[PDB]
């Protein structure tokens, strides 16, 4: 047999056949739920952590059940890496999209005015 | 399975949940509620049989 | 003081710490199908630790949230750099370069040797290449994950670019709710008004100090680059942020009362009855491991919120204005600041006036005119060697003496010291 | 919540048998339920101990709030502060404190300029020679002349001895115009 760090067998010598066996666990990685509110709707967004996979690829991972959105609002529901999620009408649906840092502005540069 | 069952204020059973139906009710189970607010929750990680 | 010199400071304040999430029926009761019957005998230990966990990751973002984001507008680059002689360039991004973050911020994200955290590790990654024993993969599959911060690097290096271009434009005007636009000139000449000095000083000197500040700023990105310790307050929140998911890890090879501490060896040589006693002192003690791990990431998050409201209330006092509380913004007197981001925190860059060469002066209190003390407006009466002249105590500017620079008050017979001369 | 969450804890089995008392006690001697006893007596003492080290804990930060909530009332509303985004959003004038259930209330009244106005100015003024820097202010361009105003109001003023000061000569500053005092 074998043993990690801490004590588990991943490693089994296979008795027939001697050929060393990697033994791994089979449940791994991350999933969450995203939900506007049991009073509003039924409907909800699930998000994998570890995947590559209406999905819908993020920097967290891959979030299904939601649409793309490629106009930016502020955010509602704080999904990791810069991504929202809102319940907007396009009936209803959950919708990601980029927060929006501010509101955009220039200031041009004298160096004889002021503003008083 | 694994059930979550409701008592109203007499000794009845008038509405149940599954634990493994749907996401948003393993997330119901989790929280031990029926109405659930707006926001983002985790839940068990992926299990495979 | 006789002459001046323009000194630029370093300041590294944490204001986050990684965000991190278990799932405890995978670190304890792993994949048994049998001790989960168990777990639920034990209570909803689990929904407490889970809900306290999220509450410090809600808090991470809303410190973020609040050291960064405290300008509504975000002011684009002034595409110039160069504001009557001081070099603003190493500090705000350029366009033509392939990160949106400029030279002084790419050196400080290259100190901190992250632990690389790739927020996707798929379950490819972790079933090969196993020879390497990566301690990620081994933190994954025991339940044990990071989530990912919700401002990413590039929004808060858009922060502080809008942050120092507001600043260099606009000036102290703009942490109110308007911006009102001014050379970088009379802004400086401003802060030296407000320091004690008078306006003379800068434009008449405008060329030596524009060279001190650039000189300051190149000797700021020697020291970033040749200095091995310097942002170690910042690497030292990683270092405990591993050590203690790694010190989890490890802990699942104990056995707490039990005659082994991996399961599926017990379940397999033992019946039902027998077999229950030991599970039960495992998950007992695993769950003691995680109430202490929970407990320690709430006594670190306590700090780290004090760590990030300090440098909030520094960054709004000192980088939207000018303040004139003694060594809080800078070593010295404070003139302003820039900020710099940095991983899981902040970098300041405070700007201050140091005076350098001394004089000696013998002085008196008051001056003796007609019979009628003539007590200083504002300074100290200096004897400069041939007559009596008045000057400010931050810079020698022999001044003649007359009626505007005192006030009469009083006779010559209770002050003490009074030296006769004229006005 | 958290002594809702106390309360529910009374129903876990601590490895024993059963989660409630006067039942292990009535189907075992005394010998016996002893250990079911001391099982339970450990597990409901450690969940004590979890309870009293969060409220400790919470108390930190509390206290916290507490101390700077007392120095926001001392400064803003025992008098004006100086201090940049403190006391509220822009100059502060004054404030007033009002009581809130396990809290306090801070009403603070600012000053918040509204509209702007362009105009060109010049860093000083050469009159005969010598140039004549500002006492306090900025000097600017009303239009038809030189004039100089404050920074937070613009309130035009004949450029006189009294609200200027001589100083070197009229080659080292950039950008002197000349006018008249
Ligand atoms: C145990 O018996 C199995 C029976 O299959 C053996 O497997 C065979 O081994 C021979 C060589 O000994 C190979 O030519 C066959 O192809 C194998 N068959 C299979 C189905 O794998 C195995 O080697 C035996 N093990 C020992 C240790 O004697
Ligand atoms: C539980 O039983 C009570 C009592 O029968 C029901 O509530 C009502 O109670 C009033 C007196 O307070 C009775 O006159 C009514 O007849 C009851 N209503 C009904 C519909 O029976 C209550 O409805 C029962 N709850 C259930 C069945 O869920
Ligand atoms: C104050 O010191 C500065 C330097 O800190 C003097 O300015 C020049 O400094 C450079 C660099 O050291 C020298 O090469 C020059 O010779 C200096 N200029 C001179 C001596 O005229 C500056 O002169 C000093 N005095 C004042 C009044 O500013
Ligand atoms: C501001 O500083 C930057 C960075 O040092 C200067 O850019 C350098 O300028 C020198 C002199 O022309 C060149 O030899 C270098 O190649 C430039 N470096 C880079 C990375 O572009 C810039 O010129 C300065 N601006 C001024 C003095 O106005
Ligand atoms: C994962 O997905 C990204 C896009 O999000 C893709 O570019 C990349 O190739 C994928 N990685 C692997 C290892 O398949
Ligand atoms: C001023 O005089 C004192 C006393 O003689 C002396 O110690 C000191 O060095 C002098 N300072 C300067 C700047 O010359
Ligand atoms: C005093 O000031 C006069 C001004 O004419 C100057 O000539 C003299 O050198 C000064 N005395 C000193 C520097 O000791
Ligand atoms: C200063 O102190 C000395 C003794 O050190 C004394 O002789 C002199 O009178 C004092 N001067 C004044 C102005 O008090
Ligand atoms: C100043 O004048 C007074 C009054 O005549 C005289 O007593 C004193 O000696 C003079 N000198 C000084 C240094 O005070
Ligand atoms: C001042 O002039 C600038 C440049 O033309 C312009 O953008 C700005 O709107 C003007 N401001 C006001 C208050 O008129
Ligand atoms: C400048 O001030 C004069 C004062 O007489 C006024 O008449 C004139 O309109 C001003 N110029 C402007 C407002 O452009
Ligand atoms: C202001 O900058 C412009 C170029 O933008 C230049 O022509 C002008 O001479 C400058 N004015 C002063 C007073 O330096
Ligand atoms: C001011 O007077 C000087 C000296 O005669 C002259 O050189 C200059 O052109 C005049 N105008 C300005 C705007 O400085």
Redesign the interface.
Known sequence: FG????????SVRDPKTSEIL?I?????????????????S?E?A???????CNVFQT???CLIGAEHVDTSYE????????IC?S?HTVQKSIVAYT?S???????????????? | TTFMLKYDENGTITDAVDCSQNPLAELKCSVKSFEIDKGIYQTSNFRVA | PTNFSISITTEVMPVSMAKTSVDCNMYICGDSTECANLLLQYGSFCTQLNRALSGIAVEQDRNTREVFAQVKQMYKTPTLKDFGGFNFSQILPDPLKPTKRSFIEDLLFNKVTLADAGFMKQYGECLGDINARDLICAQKFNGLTVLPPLLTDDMIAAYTAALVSGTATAGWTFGAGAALQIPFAMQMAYRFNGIGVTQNVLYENQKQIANQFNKAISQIQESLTTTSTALGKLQDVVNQNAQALNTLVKQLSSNFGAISSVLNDILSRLDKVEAEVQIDRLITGRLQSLQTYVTQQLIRAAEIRASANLAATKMSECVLGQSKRVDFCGKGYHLMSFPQAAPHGVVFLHVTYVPSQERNFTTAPAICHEGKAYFPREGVFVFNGTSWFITQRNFFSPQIITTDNTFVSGSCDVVIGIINNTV
Do not use: E
Not at chain 1, 3 to 10: K, W
Not at chain 1, 46 to 52: A, F, G, M, S
């Open positions: 043993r990690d760090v801490s004590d588990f067998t991943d990697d791994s666990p089979c449940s791994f990685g991350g999933v969450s739920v995203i939900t506007p509110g049991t009073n509003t039924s909800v699930v998000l994998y952590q570890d995947v590559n920097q967290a991972g955010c509602d529901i704080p999904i990791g890496a810069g999620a319940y927060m840092l501010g509101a955009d502005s220039s200031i041009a540069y004298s160096n004889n005015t002021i503003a008083i």
